[PDB]
Design a protein around this nucleic acid. Structure first.
Ligand SMILES: [K+]
Ligand SMILES: [K+]
Ligand SMILES: [K+]
Ligand SMILES: [K+]
Ligand SMILES: [K+]
Ligand SMILES: [K+]
Ligand SMILES: [K+]
Ligand SMILES: [K+]
Ligand SMILES: [K+]
Ligand SMILES: [K+]
Ligand SMILES: [Mg+2]
Ligand SMILES: [Mg+2]
Ligand SMILES: [Mg+2]
Ligand SMILES: [Mg+2]
Ligand SMILES: [Mg+2]
Ligand SMILES: [Mg+2]
Ligand SMILES: [Mg+2]
Ligand SMILES: [Mg+2]
Ligand SMILES: [Mg+2]
Ligand SMILES: [Mg+2]
Ligand SMILES: [Mg+2]
Ligand SMILES: [Mg+2]
Ligand SMILES: [Mg+2]
Ligand SMILES: [Mg+2]
Ligand SMILES: [Mg+2]
Ligand SMILES: [Mg+2]
Ligand SMILES: [Mg+2]
Ligand SMILES: [Mg+2]
Ligand SMILES: [Mg+2]
Ligand SMILES: [Mg+2]
Ligand SMILES: [Mg+2]
Ligand SMILES: [Mg+2]
Ligand SMILES: [Mg+2]
Ligand SMILES: [Mg+2]
Ligand SMILES: [Mg+2]
Ligand SMILES: [Mg+2]
Ligand SMILES: [Mg+2]
Ligand SMILES: [Mg+2]
Ligand SMILES: [Zn+2]
Lengths: 70, 50, 101, 100, 82, 208
RNA sequence: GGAAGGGCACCACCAGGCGUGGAGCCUGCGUUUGACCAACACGGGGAAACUUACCGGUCCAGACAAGCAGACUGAGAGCUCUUUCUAUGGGUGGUGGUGCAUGGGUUCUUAGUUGGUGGAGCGAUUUGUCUGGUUAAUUCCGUUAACGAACGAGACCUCAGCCUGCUAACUAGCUAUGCGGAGCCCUCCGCAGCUAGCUUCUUAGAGGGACUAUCGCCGUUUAGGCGACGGAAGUUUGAGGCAAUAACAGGUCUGUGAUGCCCUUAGAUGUUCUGGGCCGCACGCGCGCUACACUGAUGUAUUCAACGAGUAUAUAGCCUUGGCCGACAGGCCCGGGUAAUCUUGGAAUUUCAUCGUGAUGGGGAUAGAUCAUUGCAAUUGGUCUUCAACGAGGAAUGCCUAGUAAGCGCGAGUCAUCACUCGCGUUGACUACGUCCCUGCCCUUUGUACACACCG
């Protein structure tokens, strides 16, 4: 997963170079095994899962786009 | 329990005297809120001159 | 031999001045050259804070201000006689530091 | 027409002061004359410089439309993006927005 | 609050050999300022002895301080069966 | 190592912490300040009390000496802490402050307690005294009541060395009562009574 | 009091300087709340996580004192598994209410307030505390049924302003010489001389200096005032700190292990984390930032400050010097400073030119593409493109009299990242030096059917 982040925008490049937490691989393992109810939205979209639902706090981009609370 | 990273921010620093999370003065490492610090200014050695 | 530097740190001018004169004259007792006293530039700590515990009322700020005074003495002598001279009594508010110079 | 070529090409979209500067000096064109003096023997050179930035040694960052979603060069509503739908910058719009 | 035998032993030894107690109101600090015990355990144990008259308290600037008496030392001897 | 500014701030806040800790433990004895000095290899911290025979109890003083050694991570055999008697109980502002607090807590009427304290401060030899009690005494409405006499300056630089003031918040049965005591000190050239300098308005004349 | 006199004030005016209200911007008030001259960049309140008081699961932080590897979830959090907590009695936490139960303002920056004895009145009360002349002043001289006194003012303290006087400076400087650098000398840059000499230049201490003294006039021959020489200073020199009595149902229970009462005290109103929200917007108002351009933008090239702050050495959390790489944003190496040593060698303005009066190169709102830093997790900063309103702003409205206003930056607080407030310095003026006309404040006389006191 080097060419993709290489032509990804600056923010995905920096964030993926900065490392990942445990919940990211927990999420990807759950997604590939199931092949969506978590509240986390700070995963920059890679072409892995191209093919929704996040807690809004009341009920090449992050998942911090569809989390609209009002 | 306290899983959120408290390495910085008002969630880690409190007034040494009282314990508020607001009004924290930090200059010269005072580590106290303005009310408590103004209460003990004479005690610390902080005296008005002008 | 083995020049010795003593630093005198305080907040009160009178105590520092009297103890500095006392120490310099004591060094002069042993017939010893003393370069000084050197009056280190005073350093000021300024802090401003709002009196009102709650922001209600016109904003009035008090300005606490502390002064730190310092003197430095260099004595071209063996350290033992420096310790002998400084071994005499002291007054409150003055801190004595000794270093090899 | 009458404005200097330094800022005569500011009018055409996609080109401002910076690209006008990058084109009026990379074709070895005179700079202290107006556009009305400019004739056809240098208009073709100007368009060649403008239309072919990378081949003319334009610094790669200078191009405005950079690395499209995939080539350095000089939809949001449909994909349901907060940027296309929306202020996107996240502004304290409690007071502003009084234009209608 | 549940307390292990070894931890209570260590707290008692610290209270006996060095009969002065101080503590900081920070259970996130998993080590008591001198002994490796977590702060919460020793604080709750002391608050348990608080109503037992064996120690007297003084709280100054978010800091617990605890002061000993004859009942405290005799309780320590009774628990340790010295 | 530690810079001078941080160290000075640390000792200032440490002295404030020591004052707060000692004033909330010697309520039965009348803690009346502390003097701290740093001699070569020794850090002396002498506590003051109106009643000293009860501070000694001298084992408890040794426990309170270990208190600063181990709580503040001070080195052993480098810190000393003893107790001392007040030169003048009445002339000390905090002494009469907690004396009035104790008197009102015991069951005496507040008015009589302040009259007694007011007589005691003139027994000491104060130039003037002032006692202000604010809060609810008997009624739901709170009131401010004062007893003052003698010389009572109110402004200028001389206010911060020619007077001694103390303020306390005594927790009563029905609430918290605020007490303030202010004592004027006369000119003692030696300096044992009050200030060592005369007042700007006080001028002495040598007869011809 | 839309009554008569006296006095004072750029939070009042006259004479002006800048402005606000008009444009865009951001920030507060009218998805936690407090606050209505004296709320509205205020709660030091510039909230990505907590702060948090508003809206899923979780432990008991119920102390003291009758009875014993599977699935769901965001999260093997909890439930399957392990293992030797209760029924009360009650305690802790509560940013839950009560600031009208309480404790710990730009009333009033004005000069005012009160005992003791004495005099007058049956008494509330009154004189002292005042006809008059002065003062910033209830400051003083005097008058005097008052005399003698307490506060406030003054006095006091801090800083700046002057010292070719003193004290003494290798963590600060000045000069000469010697050496090296260039055009012997002379112009000239750098380096030493453990004393070349000195403290004139910077630092910091003791001191001095100004007290209205002399000159004239005025006033009473007082108190003092005006104009003069001199002097650094003739306004107590300027600017501040402190600042009396009496109150507000002024603010704060959401600063306080300050606290009384009511309420939760276990499907907890605390506690721990997850996410959101306070950042809403058709709309009204409030404090400031950026402009309307040619007195300018833009591009070259001269260059003059103060205040303060700056490390845990883990490779290294702070200030960062220098070298290298990178258009810039940013990265690696050499390292210094726990500090007068190192950062610290510290802009408008000013010669020169392209603009050329055009909403134009004034202006950059707003957008897209893009790189990287901070942060655990996106805030900001680089490049180009986009180029909105805006051509001195109605009623109203705020600040200010000298290095002041106005203009330009710097530091600190805020801070893992992001600048309004507190100080610092730079350039540097117009008018006024009068008054109570308006807005107030103070005193005396007077009127009153008010006393919650004319919002009567
Ligand atoms: K606070
Ligand atoms: K709007
Ligand atoms: K305007
Ligand atoms: K404000
Ligand atoms: K109050
Ligand atoms: K009388
Ligand atoms: K030479
Ligand atoms: K309070
Ligand atoms: K409460
Ligand atoms: K623009
Ligand atoms: Mg263009
Ligand atoms: Mg006085
Ligand atoms: Mg005064
Ligand atoms: Mg004004
Ligand atoms: Mg004014
Ligand atoms: Mg006018
Ligand atoms: Mg304007
Ligand atoms: Mg407006
Ligand atoms: Mg408007
Ligand atoms: Mg708000
Ligand atoms: Mg923010
Ligand atoms: Mg949270
Ligand atoms: Mg918060
Ligand atoms: Mg006012
Ligand atoms: Mg007043
Ligand atoms: Mg009488
Ligand atoms: Mg000099
Ligand atoms: Mg003088
Ligand atoms: Mg009220
Ligand atoms: Mg609290
Ligand atoms: Mg809570
Ligand atoms: Mg917003
Ligand atoms: Mg403001
Ligand atoms: Mg220019
Ligand atoms: Mg300069
Ligand atoms: Mg323009
Ligand atoms: Mg523009
Ligand atoms: Mg702010
Ligand atoms: Zn505090």
């Amino acid at each position: 997963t080097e060419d993709l982040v290489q032509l990804f925008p600056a923010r995905p490049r920096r964030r993926f170079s900065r490392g990942l937490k445990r919940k990211p691989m927990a999420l990807v393992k759950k997604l590939r095994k199931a092949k969506v109810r978590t509240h986390l939205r700070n995963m920059i979209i890679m072409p892995e899962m191209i093919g929704v639902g996040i807690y809004n706090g009341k009920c090449g981009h992050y998942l911090a786009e569809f989390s609209l609370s009002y | 329990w306290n899983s959120h990273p408290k390495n910085y921010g008002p969630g880690s620093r409190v007034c040494r005297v009282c314990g508020n999370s607001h009004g924290l003065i930090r200059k010269y490492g005072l580590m106290c809120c303005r009310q408590c610090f103004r209460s003990n200014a004479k005690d610390i050695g902080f005296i008005k001159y002008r | 031999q083995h020049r010795i530097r003593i630093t005198l740190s305080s907040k009160s001018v009178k105590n520092l001045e009297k103890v500095c004169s006392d120490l310099v004259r004591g060094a002069k007792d042993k017939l010893l050259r003393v370069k000084g006293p050197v009056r280190m530039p005073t350093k000021v700590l300024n802090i401003t804070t709002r009196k009102s515990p709650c922001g209600e009322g016109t904003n009035t700020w008090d300005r606490f201000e502390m002064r730190v005074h310092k003197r430095v003495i260099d004595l071209v002598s063996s350290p033992d006689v420096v310790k002998q001279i400084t071994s005499i009594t002291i007054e409150p508010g003055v801190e004595v530091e000794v270093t090899i110079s | 027409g009458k404005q200097k070529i330094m800022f005569a090409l500011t009018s055409i979209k996609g080109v401002g002061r910076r690209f006008s500067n990058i084109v009026c000096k990379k074709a070895d064109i005179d700079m202290n004359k107006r556009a009305g003096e400019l004739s056809a023997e240098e208009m073709d050179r100007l368009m060649a410089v403008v239309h072919n930035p990378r081949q003319f040694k334009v610094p790669d960052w200078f191009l405005n439309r950079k690395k499209d979603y995939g080539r350095f060069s000089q939809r949001l509503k449909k994909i349901r993006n907060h940027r296309g739908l929306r202020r996107v910058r996240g502004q304290h719009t409690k007071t502003t927005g009084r234009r209608g | 609050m549940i307390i292990s035998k070894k931890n209570r032993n260590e707290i008692c030894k610290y209270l006996f050999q060095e009969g002065v107690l101080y503590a900081k109101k920070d259970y996130n600090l998993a080590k008591h300022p001198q002994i490796d015990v977590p702060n919460l355990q020793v604080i709750k144990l002391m608050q348990s002895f608080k109503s037992k008259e064996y120690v007297r308290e003084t709280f100054s600037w978010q800091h617990y301080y605890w002061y000993l008496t004859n009942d405290g030392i005799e309780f320590l001897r009774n628990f340790l069966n010295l | 190592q530690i810079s001078k500014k941080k160290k000075f701030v640390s000792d200032g806040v440490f002295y404030a912490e020591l004052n707060e800790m000692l004033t909330r433990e010697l309520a039965e004895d009348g803690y009346s300040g502390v003097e701290v000095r740093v001699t070569p290899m020794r850090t002396e911290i002498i506590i003051r009390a109106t009643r000293t025979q009860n501070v000694l109890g001298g084992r408890r003083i040794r426990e309170l000496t270990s208190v600063v050694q181990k709580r503040f991570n001070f080195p052993e055999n480098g810190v000393e802490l003893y107790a001392e008697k007040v030169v003048n109980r009445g002339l000390c502002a905090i002494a009469q402050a907690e004396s009035l607090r104790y008197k009102l807590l015991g069951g005496l009427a507040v008015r009589r307690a302040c009259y007694g304290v007011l007589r005691f401060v003139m027994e000491s030899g104060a130039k003037g005294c002032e006692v202000i009690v604010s809060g609810k005494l008997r009624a739901q409405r709170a009131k401010s009541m004062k007893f003052k006499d003698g010389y009572m300056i109110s402004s200028g630089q001389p206010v911060n060395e020619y007077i001694d003031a103390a303020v306390r918040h005594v927790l009563l049965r029905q609430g918290v009562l605020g007490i303030k005591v202010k004592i004027m000190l006369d000119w003692d050239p030696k300096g044992k009574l009050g200030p060592t300098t005369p007042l700007p308005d006080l001028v002495t004349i040598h007869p011809p």
